[PDB]
Design a protein around this ligand. Sequence first.
Ligand SMILES: Nc1ncnc2c1ncn2[C@@H]1O[C@H](COP(=O)(O)OP(=O)(O)O)[C@@H](O)[C@H]1O
Ligand SMILES: Nc1ncnc2c1ncn2[C@@H]1O[C@H](COP(=O)(O)OP(=O)(O)O)[C@@H](O)[C@H]1O
Ligand SMILES: Nc1ncnc2c1ncn2[C@@H]1O[C@H](COP(=O)(O)OP(=O)(O)O)[C@@H](O)[C@H]1O
Lengths: 374, 373, 374, 54, 42
Amino acid sequence: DDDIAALVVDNGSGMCKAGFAGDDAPRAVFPSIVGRPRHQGVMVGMGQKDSYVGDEAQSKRGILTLKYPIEHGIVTNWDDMEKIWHHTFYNELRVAPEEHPVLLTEAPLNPKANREKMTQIMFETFNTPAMYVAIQAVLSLYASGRTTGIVMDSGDGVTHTVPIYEGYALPHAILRLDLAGRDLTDYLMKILTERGYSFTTTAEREIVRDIKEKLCYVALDFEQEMATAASSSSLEKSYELPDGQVITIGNERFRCPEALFQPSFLGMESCGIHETTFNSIMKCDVDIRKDLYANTVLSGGTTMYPGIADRMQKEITALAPSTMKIKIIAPPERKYSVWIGGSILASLSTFQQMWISKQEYDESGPSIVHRKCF
Amino acid sequence: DDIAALVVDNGSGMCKAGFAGDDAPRAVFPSIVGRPRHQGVMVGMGQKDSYVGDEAQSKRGILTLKYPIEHGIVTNWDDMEKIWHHTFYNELRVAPEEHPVLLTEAPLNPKANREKMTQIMFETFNTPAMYVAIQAVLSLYASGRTTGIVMDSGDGVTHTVPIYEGYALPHAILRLDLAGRDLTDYLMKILTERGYSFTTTAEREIVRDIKEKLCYVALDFEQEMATAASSSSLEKSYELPDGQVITIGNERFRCPEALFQPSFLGMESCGIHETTFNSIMKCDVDIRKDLYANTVLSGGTTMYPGIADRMQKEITALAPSTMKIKIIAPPERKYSVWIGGSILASLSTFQQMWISKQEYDESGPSIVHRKCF
Amino acid sequence: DDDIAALVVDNGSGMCKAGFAGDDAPRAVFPSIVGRPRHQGVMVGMGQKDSYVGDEAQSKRGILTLKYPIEHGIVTNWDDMEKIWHHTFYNELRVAPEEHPVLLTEAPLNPKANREKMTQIMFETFNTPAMYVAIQAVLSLYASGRTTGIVMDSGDGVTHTVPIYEGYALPHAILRLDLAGRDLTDYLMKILTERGYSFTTTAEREIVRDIKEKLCYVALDFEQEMATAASSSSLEKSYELPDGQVITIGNERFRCPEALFQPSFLGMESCGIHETTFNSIMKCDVDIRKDLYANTVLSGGTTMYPGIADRMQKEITALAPSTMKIKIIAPPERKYSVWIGGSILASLSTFQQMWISKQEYDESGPSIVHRKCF
Amino acid sequence: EEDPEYLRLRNRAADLRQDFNLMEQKKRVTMILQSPSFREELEGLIQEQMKKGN
Amino acid sequence: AVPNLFVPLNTNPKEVQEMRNKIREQNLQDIKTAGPQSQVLC
Ligand SMILES: Nc1ncnc2c1ncn2[C@@H]1O[C@H](COP(=O)(O)OP(=O)(O)O)[C@@H](O)[C@H]1O
Ligand SMILES: Nc1ncnc2c1ncn2[C@@H]1O[C@H](COP(=O)(O)OP(=O)(O)O)[C@@H](O)[C@H]1O
Ligand SMILES: Nc1ncnc2c1ncn2[C@@H]1O[C@H](COP(=O)(O)OP(=O)(O)O)[C@@H](O)[C@H]1O
């Protein structure tokens, strides 16, 4: 408070998290949604607004069309993005952006112009003194405590695995897959139609996402678990809807996350995450693979399915040579780990040299971010 | 501040009127028009072509009572003009040019009704501003909550509408043509079984008084049939205007039961409890548990003793068992709409929403669909 | 000892069609309604009919409460549906059910209990020798005679779009919409309310459906058509009730089917049928899209309004890139097209090995329908 | 109550509180920061990205 | 424009809540009041 502390903002497709530099915990975590009313409103003299933003939007789900501003990790509606950032700065943190620097995170492989846009609407409108952009998955490795290893980050919008050697990333070995939690929610909604239950609107998609977060797990063996569900009815759970109805999902608990390992269910050509990180390792040099097998770190919201670590280790050990040792690293707070890495990066004294000055931006236009940020 | 507005509720049965910002209406009187039918022989008593409102009720022996509003629709506009003139000049004693007026009407009505109402209130009475509102929204104002499903039953029509957080879902509005006049006609039909015959329009008011005084909603229908068949403890005695004494007995809880089973009248439609449940299920998933906890009863027809317990039990039976059902019936639910009107009429932010006289002049009577609701 | 031609039985919601295999047109077409009396029978010596089934039930509409056994393509009353099937087999076609194979149709995304119950009640009660269940849209594209195209079937009950390229159907590109003729009939009742006419009973709902069939059209330009209807009274038509009363529709002629393209009138937030077709096309692979833009096929009774083809072609051209040609194929007899395709699929000599046999049913149970047919 | 702290406790769900407590107990940022060797090793590493970028 | 055509936006609900209580105060206190008297009468 005596000195200006930077703002660490982690912004993915699913939720937005914001906090102060050097803090243990982010101050605000809220879904990245902008809702607009659809029904006729006749109640004059009481509270109506033309648009709802943040957790207030998810509170009044029954009278809105929920609309995600970030699609597959790419910003597609910039006005809603500015509204999200305004609600982040003023409603939640309640600090003006002009006093403090801000730090943003972004996907590894992306359209170029997005970064330019993230520059232009951050200096021109919010009048920040300085900012910086960092790759999301590097911060997971920084927060885990390791300078060398391969990290998979599978958020709600995009999945990507990057190998980092001696704290300094390799661009040619970066693998990006467009398969994340939202596609899993859509697949779960599609396969829940076969039992009779129907979910079609946006609030129903939020309810289905809640069902997925509550009752899903990854089977160690798909065939054995499927035969087990074919034998008895011990794999049945009952979830109570906000209407008051009770549904019994049963067999679908381990079929929804299995699309992560077998993307042929969705019809996509690309194969599962385990062989994806195997190919990412194989694209690197032979000498560094020994450190890469022993330092595999999982991160992101989708990687919080129960039993994901054992299945991942078994598959990647089946793919790996027999003489090599496999170690998976699953932090218990992996869902926030990227933000934690940001808090590490905003506290280093050398990082004061990294900041893009406002004068430098005014001199060089919005293209300063490619040469300044790596 | 300046001049206060007028609040007028025109239901199908009775008309209510008062000043905005007041607790209760000043003038409450039945909406009837009577004309004489016999010969007049006494020379010099003076002539009177029509009897309007309460004056027609006292001299109803020598008149043919006629209702201008039928099923929530104004059929005879001349009698409506007579009723409005009587309300403005004889009941409230105010010049209509100084005051704005706020009117009430049903959810689903023909367009020509609203257009003709706007044309009448601008062209003849020369009011400076006017507005039309739905009655059940005003009931939700009277209750004082932002969220709930409200069911209003008058003398002309019954309607249910759900509102969530100030937004009203238009596709979930349900209208049912089962009201107090149909129950009065059914009581006239079932009173024949004991030997009492009422035919002319004068005796319809006697039957209505009988219904208002000695009718109640049974909690369990078949058990009450068994009880009334076993004993004579359910009989009550009423005195006619001419001095004869009638005794109803079994028919006390069979007339208001017909709301819950419309097959007694020959109607194919469902009961009021099933109508409310269906209107709830027409909404979205997330607002249903809020609508279960804020059901509001409105209108005079819901003033039978024991209506709340029967409604709560029926909706509890139909709904899933994991949630709680509470029915909020204020004791003064007869005038709730009018009270809501007052709360709407003198809000500070409502003053920009009156239909101006200049706007009507430059737009025709079609301006009421663009504004209002 | 020639093999006897099979029976083709098309069952959407609201109409049942049936005929012999190898014939051009079905023998029997009748509404799928069942009515029961509600009033007291006082004349002794009358016939004792508990239930009026089918077209006969539409003769005496005044004394019955009509009900539909299918709701949104799902059979909600099986014992009632058995009456329609028995009346079809014994009274219209008057054929022995044990002597011919039976071919049936259903919607794409249905609960598995529907298919299993259909197979069980066809083998166990009517004692058929063989049966098969086929998806309707594939049959319609058989009737069109092209081996590659996207077909949008809109019937009373359901609307669904499937694409087919070179005899292969993509399962993930199938889209299903619960916006159909019955919802349009209800909306027509709601908008006819404000003119001054009130219809409440189901017998009056049939009259409203007849008014919709006789006097409706789809406008190319909605705002211009509304302005024309407001300016002049030329767009007015008259209808006579069974009571005998001239009613005049006027504005509501082109507003009832316009809800197909703008489902926000009903309160549903789903996209229109044009955007549904476009989204189904864009979900497919790139190299087939051009062919799918050139072979759009319409089917079903709901697509029988005048001016649907021109409006849909204009809207898809407004959505598609300008360099491609959009052609809308609408046969004049398209309402029966699904059934026609079934007859062709019942007449191929190649198909005859793929009937679900009774013998294999005896050991596989009613679950053989998922293994055998699509 | 009208206090924003009371509404802050009123609004947020149980799992957010669970995560906040879980990653407040371990204090990962403090463990990375006040430990000298790792902290000043990243100090140096960021020094060579400055050297190496331009 | 179509969702909230009929009402103005950004209005506090506390105003309506205050006015309902103000009207209920007269019922509790049993106030004598007369209607507004006309200017032409004056
Ligand atoms: N405990 C959990 N179990 C299963 N899935 C989860 C869990 N928590 C989050 N998810 C999934 O992960 C998504 C959130 O991912 P997140 O890491 O917040 O994305 P980002 O932070 O990149 O925006 C949610 O949409 C949800 O589907
Ligand atoms: N105390 C009462 N008990 C039972 N029924 C009543 C009572 N008062 C009125 N009613 C019924 O309600 C009708 C009047 O309802 P009202 O509120 O005047 O309707 P509206 O104002 O909409 O015309 C009467 O016809 C009568 O049938
Ligand atoms: N000539 C027509 N013009 C306009 N609409 C029609 C016509 N014929 C039928 N319809 C509508 O189509 C529906 C019948 O659909 P149909 O094709 O019979 O469904 P299915 O065959 O799947 O049962 C009816 O509800 C009616 O509203």
